[PDB]
From Swiss-Prot, chains A, C, D:
Leader peptide range in chain numbering: none
BTB domain span: 5-107
Role this protein plays: Its interaction with CUL3 suggests that it may act as a substrate adapter in some E3 ligase complex. Does not affect the function of Kv channel Kv2.1/KCNB1, Kv1.2/KCNA2, Kv4.2/KCND2 and Kv3.4/KCNC4.
Native species: Homo sapiens (Human)
Protein name as it appears in the record: BTB/POZ domain-containing protein KCTD5
Subunit structure: Homopentamer. Interacts (via C-terminus) with GRASP55/GORASP2. Interacts with CUL3 and with ubiquitinated proteins. Interacts with CRY1. (Microbial infection) Interacts with adeno-associated virus 2 (AAV-2) REP proteins.
Domain comment in the entry: The BTB (POZ) domain is atypical and mediates the formation of a homopentamer instead of a homotetramer. Homopentamerization is due to the presence of 4 residues in the BTB (POZ) domain: Leu-17, Gly-61, Val-73 and Ala-79.
Residues of the full protein shown: 40 to 153 of 234
Superkingdom as given in the UniProt entry: Eukaryota
Induction: Up-regulated in peripheral blood lymphocytes stimulated through the T-cell receptor.
UniProtKB/Swiss-Prot annotation, chain B:
Tissues expressing this chain: Brain, spermatozoa, and testis (at protein level). Widely expressed.
A Gene Ontology BP annotation from the UniProt entry: integrin-mediated signaling pathway
Protein name per UniProt: Cullin-3
Organism placement in taxonomy: Eukaryota, Metazoa, Chordata, Craniata, Vertebrata
Additional note from the record: High-glucose conditions in renal tubular epithelial cells lead to up-regulation of CUL3 expression, significant increase in CUL3-mediated ubiquitination of MRPL12 and dysregulation of mitochondrial biosynthesis.
Function statement: Core component of multiple cullin-RING-based BCR (BTB-CUL3-RBX1) E3 ubiquitin-protein ligase complexes which mediate the ubiquitination and subsequent proteasomal degradation of target proteins. BCR complexes and ARIH1 collaborate in tandem to mediate ubiquitination of target proteins. As a scaffold protein may contribute to catalysis through positioning of the substrate and the ubiquitin-conjugating enzyme.
Organism encoding this protein: Homo sapiens
Family: Belongs to the cullin family.
Subunit record text: Forms neddylation-dependent homodimers. Component of multiple BCR (BTB-CUL3-RBX1) E3 ubiquitin-protein ligase complexes formed of CUL3, RBX1 and a variable BTB domain-containing protein acting as both, adapter to cullin and substrate recognition subunit. The BCR complex may be active as a heterodimeric complex, in which NEDD8, covalently attached to one CUL3 molecule, binds to the C-terminus of a second CUL3 molecule. Interacts with RBX1, RNF7, CYCE and TIP120A/CAND1. Part of the BCR(SPOP) containing SPOP, and of BCR containing homodimeric SPOPL or the heterodimer formed by SPOP and SPOPL.
GO molecular function: cyclin binding; identical protein binding; Notch binding; POZ domain binding; ubiquitin ligase complex scaffold activity; ubiquitin protein ligase activity; ubiquitin protein ligase binding
First-to-last residue of the parent protein present: 24 to 286 of 768
GO cellular component, one term: postsynapse
Record localization: Nucleus; Golgi apparatus; Cell projection, Cilium, Flagellum; Cytoplasm, Cytoskeleton, Spindle
């Protein structure tokens, strides 16, 4: 095959299949560097070629979802701060702003009592 | 409140493990299992029971096995054996420390008893190393080898050094255990050796050659301290070296026969 | 090099993937011992090579992520009192501390007197 | 191997992997009876050899956690009554001895008029 527009990440064990354009939404993001076909990459699980990314899969959801539709979608059971740290690692600036607002809204309301 | 014989069941497996490490066949034993076992012991308010059982289980092996070889090696590669024992004992005790880490945190810091590795070395210190016949035979054996080295004999300096390191670590955070058993006997022993040599060479040559030997001996002994003894022994020996060869013979050196500072 | 930098913790049946240097934040930690190639680990291994660990697979999340980004990630539903006794087992002494305060922190609002 | 210290529980749909010792904390426990190698029990998935226990996997966590670290850890969503009855099934007389108090403590605190 010439190339696979589909790429198979491994994020803390959980395989997250996705497409380059999903990963190329932000010029300065960690995930963007993975997309490069330059020789600087050695975490391919050669049994299938899945690149390995050692971090928590559970919070990888909102990161990947935002990386497709640009809104902070959440499963309530996930931690508010955990997504802040999780994206922080991946370097999606626009998102980590949004969550920092999400936390701000969460606590600010939580910080008030009539 | 209630109590269970179940505590012993895990204790036996934890005990059974410790022997096997000391038997030097780890195949089959698993750290994951043991740490949780130890965890369960300390968690059920049995730290004192676990703490005591540790002290015994190691102690028996040292006195029943380790000491026996050291006694058996008194006149056959002794230094090799005693080092070998403490090398292996180190290997075993790190595992013991690794299996008891939780107990090493909660019970030790709460009850002010000595930590696991302190106990591991201490029992090796009280029961085998500082044991009279081994202790003195150890001291004598090393002193036998060093003097012969001073007598031009090719000697395994590393063997002596290793034992010196062995004793140093056996002292925990202080030099004392090294000072009590080897250093202080060594320093005063060398004074008699230095004292005898000083008057020997005074009757063999004049001041300049006497000085030449003294400086070389000063360097020679220090070099041995670097390469055959602990490096912390240097200053002690130098004060002894200076006191015996130089300080005792000052007025002589000033006034040697047809020589001296006057001449 | 006949060795890898990524380990598979089979905690509580769950597979957690993480990299050696991730676990070494506290060398006095249970995991750090697991992280090595010592003469007392070979027994605890799976057919896959994953290390077989026998504690809770769900409260492990905050513990492992703390070893990743030095902050507690408590999924909101989980109980603060529950990770503490998972923390204790792993011997992350500093982590044990901050949860305890969190437990104490919770009572500031829950054990309050209006 | 003739024996394996790890027992594989299929507790009503969600797998649990735990050590024999953890289940055997008090032999009266129905869980302990499962661990024994006697010939009475034969219910397990043939391929994987996991005991088939037909009970709520969710509420089993607090039951197994007590049998792992001797305390009652219950996620905020799990009903205390649910673990209580769940605990009753396994016959860990100590756990049920605890749950009712928390139950009573929970209710007494709530309905308490100042």
């Amino acid at each position: 095959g010439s190339v696979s527009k589909w790429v198979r990440l491994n994020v803390g064990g959980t395989y997250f299949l996705t497409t380059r354009q999903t990963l190329c939404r932000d010029p300065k993001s960690f995930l963007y560097r993975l997309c490069q076909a330059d020789p600087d990459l050695d975490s391919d699980k050669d049994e299938t070629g899945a690149y390995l990314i050692d971090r928590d899969p559970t919070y990888f959801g909102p990161v990947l979802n935002y990386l497709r539709h640009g809104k902070l979608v959440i499963n309530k059971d996930l931690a508010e701060e955990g997504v802040l740290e999780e994206a922080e690692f991946y370097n999606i600036t626009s998102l980590i702003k949004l969550v920092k607002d999400k936390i701000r809204e969460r606590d600010s309301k939580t910080s008030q009592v009539p | 409140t209630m109590d269970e014989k179940y505590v012993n069941s895990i204790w036996d497996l934890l005990k059974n493990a410790i022997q096997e490490i000391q038997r030097k066949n780890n195949s089959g034993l698993s750290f994951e299992e043991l740490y949780r076992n130890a965890y369960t012991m300390v968690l059920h308010k049995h730290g004192e029971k676990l703490y005591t059982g540790l002290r015994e289980v190691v102690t028996e092996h040292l006195i029943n096995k380790v000491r026996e070889d050291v006694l058996n090696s008194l006149n056959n590669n002794f230094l090799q054996t005693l080092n070998q024992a403490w090398n292996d004992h180190q290997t075993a005790m790190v595992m013991i420390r690794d299996i008891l880490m939780y107990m090493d945190r909660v019970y030790v810091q709460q009850n002010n008893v000595e930590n696991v590795y302190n106990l591991g070395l201490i029992i090796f210190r009280d029961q085998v190393v500082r044991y009279g016949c081994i202790r003195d035979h150890l001291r004598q054996t090393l002193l036998d080898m060093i003097a012969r080295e001073r007598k031009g004999e090719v000697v395994d300096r590393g063997a002596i050094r290793n034992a010196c390191q062995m004793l140093m670590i056996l002292g925990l955070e202080g030099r004392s255990v090294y000072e009590e058993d080897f250093e202080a006997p060594f320093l005063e022993m060398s004074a008699e050796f230095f004292q005898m040599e000083s008057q020997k060479f005074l009757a063999e040559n004049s001041a300049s050659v006497y000085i030449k030997k003294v400086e070389a001996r000063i360097n020679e002994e220090i070099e041995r301290v670097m390469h055959c003894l602990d490096k912390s022994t240097e200053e002690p020996i130098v004060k002894v070296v200076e006191r015996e060869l130089i300080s005792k013979h000052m007025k002589t050196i000033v006034e040697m026969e047809n020589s001296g500072l006057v001449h």
